Design an enzyme around this catalytic site. Structure first.
Site, PDB file in Angstrom:
ATOM      1  CG  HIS A 153      -3.620   5.096  -0.319  1.00 12.50           C
ATOM      2  ND1 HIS A 153      -4.224   5.859  -1.297  1.00 12.50           N
ATOM      3  CD2 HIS A 153      -3.493   3.852  -0.836  1.00 12.50           C
ATOM      4  CE1 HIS A 153      -4.527   5.084  -2.324  1.00 12.50           C
ATOM      5  NE2 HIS A 153      -4.152   3.851  -2.040  1.00 12.50           N
ATOM      6  CG  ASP A 154      -4.928   9.410  -0.023  1.00 14.75           C
ATOM      7  OD1 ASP A 154      -4.438  10.495   0.354  1.00 14.75           O
ATOM      8  OD2 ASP A 154      -4.363   8.653  -0.851  1.00 14.75           O
ATOM      9  N   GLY A 208      -8.435   2.189  -0.108  1.00 12.89           N
ATOM     10  CA  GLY A 208      -7.801   3.482  -0.405  1.00 12.89           C
ATOM     11  C   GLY A 208      -8.850   4.491  -0.810  1.00 12.89           C
TER      12      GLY A 208
END
Lengths: 257, 257, 256
Positions: free
Chosen positions: A120-121, A138
């Site tokens: 994520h991100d 992440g």
């Protein structure tokens, strides 16, 4: 027909007219796919996700799932993928979280090999190569042209500089400056990616300046703040050296030594 | 309908209320699934296996296969999974072996991330987190609240203590006592998981007592027997220290140092 | 035997008795031999030949092109022998024209979940590749070798007969026959006596191998000197000759 009748295409999905989708693949709600993109068989795409043009996504990949990270609580977050990327077998790519910018981003002309993980991100630039089972935990930023060899592990929040290189099995817990080569667990700096530079056609003068910049940071006993001050001159003369200096200045987890 | 018609559900499988099974999934003979459990698309479940309530199993997972370790399988052996677990993409979980426990056992509220491997006869407690590609080779016991970071490898028979933590890429060959943080290949003990203690609401006094207990075991040159004797008093005062002491007492094949 | 939910290309060639599970793809120019069982959700691409009595588990991709940038569309192959077990999610790529245009696997091999067999690799017989073992490309693995979980092998390396890697080993140089290696970077520790006993080696051959290990690793010899010292024992024991030959063929150095 370009869209296999055994694929599941959600009515909200938007497919450019020549997109191909293989059998037993799922194109979920709010997934947009650009022209010329080929989706293999057994692929799971979940949205909201935008995929660009002339990509290729292989079987058993899961692209656009929620992160299992316990800080995610079902919010509307996105994944954006650019053009001319190749995503190989079993790759997992998660959407962002509201805590950061609510988006995972991948640029153009990347090659993401089998069983790589893009957490994520994370933000991947252009022309990067992530070799098999590279795992970005992440919030990881990978700048252009970086190469991460097989089973490279990258800790949350780490930055991976432009034209850098990790050896197979590297475990990266601190930032990797631009052009730096790292190896091992824990990852150690072992000079610059001179072969990559020469192949890409960097000038001899810039290569020489970068060799000197590496010494300033790594081989003269300076603190990072003294090194940054000492680099200012060469960074003003060579854009490549400015890219190096800027990668050191933006490091939040310290730099790999 | 909760059960996708493209799934294959053996006539001897038992599915409770509100069970969902996605397309192209296989629910084999002698698989029982408890209320509210969601099986994704492209999942293989093989039995005999009991899965509890409110679990979530993601695509490309193989849950309940025979271990390849033995060339000729034993039958019957079992896999038991409790409630409220999340098993992510591509996770492999093997049933037990006739020699050993004849059962692989997973408790409640665990999070097993993508491509993790839970080998035959392993026992996972409650509230654990196995990060991507964590591999438990076989006969591994993971006690409550343990966190194994990405690509942690655990040798056969090892015990991972309650509230312990491994860094990414750790290769664990000996037992990890409760609360202890380990890193590297081979894994070495660094400190304790003080952040985890604070999350659980341990008192400052218990935390201080655990810091002292680490020194007793690791930093004062005691044999394990002596350390156990020195810990008795603190272990009687603090249940938290008793957990630590107990994990050292049960380590017949040595502790990670 | 062939599930109606499988996709079998018209140019594929299946022996009698072949089983193919639901939602598997048997691509063009794939041949499969008698008694071979393809699970569900398996992707097979060609040109590829698979032999007899193999078992291939779900989510495996067998016969894909290498993503390696040097591979440019050429007709390259993949050959797999008999009695192999290929577990969940294994990836096996075909060869490249730059080498011999073929990836090759022998017989009675056990390739565990998520292992990766890169382009132009050659695996012998009776090998075990534990979960997530990765052979980067052009890797040769000789008979009876065991690679423990997450063993990474650099391009062009040779893994000797009966050799053993510990879990998480990163192998960058050749591993001589019988040698046990551990770590990242991998380092030689001892010999695989268990593998010798499994083969029924005589106590004399085992003693000769123990002595051979000391010649190479524990007497301060260069490789050349060690080879010269081994000549006598190698002529007496075929088992030692296997060891000596693995060292001699290591043009890029041995794992120490």
């Amino acid at each position: 027909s370009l869209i296999d009748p055994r694929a599941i295409i959600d009515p909200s999905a938007r497919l450019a007219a020549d997109v191909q989708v293989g059998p037993w693949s799922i194109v979920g709600a709010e997934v947009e796919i650009g022209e010329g993109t080929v989706i293999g068989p057994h692929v799971v795409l979940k949205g909201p996700t935008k995929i660009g043009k002339h990509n290729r996504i292989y079987q058993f990949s899961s692209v656009g799932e929620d992160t299992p990270d316990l800080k995610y609580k079902g919010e509307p977050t996105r994944l954006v993928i650019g053009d001319h990327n190749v995503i190989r077998e079993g790759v997992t790519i998660h959407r962002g979280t509201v805590q950061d910018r609510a988006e995972t981003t991948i640029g153009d002309h990347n090659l993401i090999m089998a069983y790589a993980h893009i957490g994520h991100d994370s933000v991947i630039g252009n022309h990067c190569i992530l070799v098999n089972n590279t795992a970005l935990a992440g919030h990881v930023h990978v700048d252009d042209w970086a190469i991460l060899s097989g089973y490279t592990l990258v800790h949350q929040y780490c930055r991976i500089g432009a034209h850098s290189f990790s050896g197979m099995g590297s475990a990266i817990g601190k930032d990797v400056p631009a052009y730096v080569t790292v190896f091992g667990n824990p990852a150690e700096a072992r000079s610059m990616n001179f072969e990559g530079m020469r192949r890409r056609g960097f000038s001899s003068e810039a290569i020489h300046a970068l060799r000197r910049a590496y010494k300033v940071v790594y081989r003269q006993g300076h603190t990072v703040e003294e090194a940054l001050a000492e680099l200012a001159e060469s960074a003003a003369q060579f854009p490549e050296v400015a890219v190096f200096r800027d990668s050191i200045q933006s490091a939040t987890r310290g730099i790999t030594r």
